Amino acid sequence: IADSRSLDFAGRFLAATGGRGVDVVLNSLAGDFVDASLRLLPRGGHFLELGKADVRDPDRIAADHPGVGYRAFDLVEAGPELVGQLLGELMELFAAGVLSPLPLTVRDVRRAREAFRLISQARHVGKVVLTMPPAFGAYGTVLVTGGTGTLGGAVARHLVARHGVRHLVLAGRSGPAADGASALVDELTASGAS
Ligand SMILES: NC(=O)c1ccc[n+]([C@@H]2O[C@H](COP(=O)([O-])OP(=O)(O)OC[C@H]3O[C@@H](n4cnc5c(N)ncnc54)[C@H](OP(=O)(O)O)[C@@H]3O)[C@@H](O)[C@H]2O)c1
Structure with a gap:
């Protein structure tokens, strides 16, 4: 050294x-x-x-x-x-097991200014990484607990409508027994989502 x-x-x-x-x-x-x-x-x-x-x-x-x-x-x-x-x-x-990702200084991309200041001041540690905002996708499953509620089911309808969700699991104590449950399933499944 x-x-x-x-x-x-x-x-x-x-x-x-x-x-x-x-x-x-x-x-x-x-x-x-x-x-x-x-x-x-x-x-x-x-x-x-x-x-x-x-x-x-x-x-x-x-x-x-x-x-x-x-x-x-x-x-x-x-x-x-x-x-x-x-x-x-x-x-x-x-x-x-021979190579390991470097130490990371992680920031939300919306907070990117401060991140570039860290870098331009040499005050970052190892590698800087920016992480995009939260997002629901058509790939992977989305869990909606209480998805037999006033809005929990309404969210489910909307996730599939405008967020492209293609896979859903609705949960609650009652479950299928909840009223409007098998009706909301048929409604969302017709919307293309499992
Ligand atoms: N609707 C509003 O105006 C409003 C206002 C402020 C806050 N919030 C909040 O928004 C959320 C939805 O409320 P909501 O108005 O739609 O009332 P809701 O129609 O009664 O829906 C609540 C859902 O949560 C389920 N639930 C209750 N306990 C559960 C447990 N231990 N585990 C799993 N599921 C459970 C219920 O299904 P099961 O009984 O079958 O388990 C029910 O389907 C709530 O968290 C509420 O605090 C709502």
Whole structure:
């Protein structure tokens, strides 16, 4: 480990590798950091830049730092067919217990301003995720307890009418015995919902 806000790392790690340096260097930092990092490829290797400030020419790097293939890249350069394979390979590993989702700072999308402030102040933890408003869907089941009531049944009619609900379970102590129950079922089932 070493501090990211100084350049001590550059001569701290070459000293820890005994001058061999490393074999690959993934950068996000700009400015003087770019050159200070190439110093950790004395024996050459890969050096690859995510940051889009201070992009460099692969050839004047290969010259000034023999055996260093430099490529600044963006995830879009992979192409959609490759992403699928890569994502397949990753999901294989998440399911094997090798990779774990990062720490999450979660917010409701309607509260997105504050979320971007967290991010722009570097005060988020790991990954920020925004979660959409509540919604009923035609996929999956919806439970309406007391769905033989003044409105509980009226809600059921309306969920299927304008919320697209296609699967319902109405519940109550009486259950089917409730009056208007088998009548409300036939009414909703005719509306296309199980
Ligand atoms: N309607 C209004 O103007 C109004 C106003 C304010 C608040 N609310 C609230 O809105 C909700 C619906 O009220 P509502 O006006 O439609 O009265 P409701 O017609 O009597 O419907 C209430 C439903 O809840 C069921 N129920 C009672 N106890 C239950 C239990 N332990 N477990 C499962 N189901 C139970 C009843 O079925 P079973 O007896 O067969 O179990 C009944 O079908 C209530 O929670 C009420 O507090 C309604």
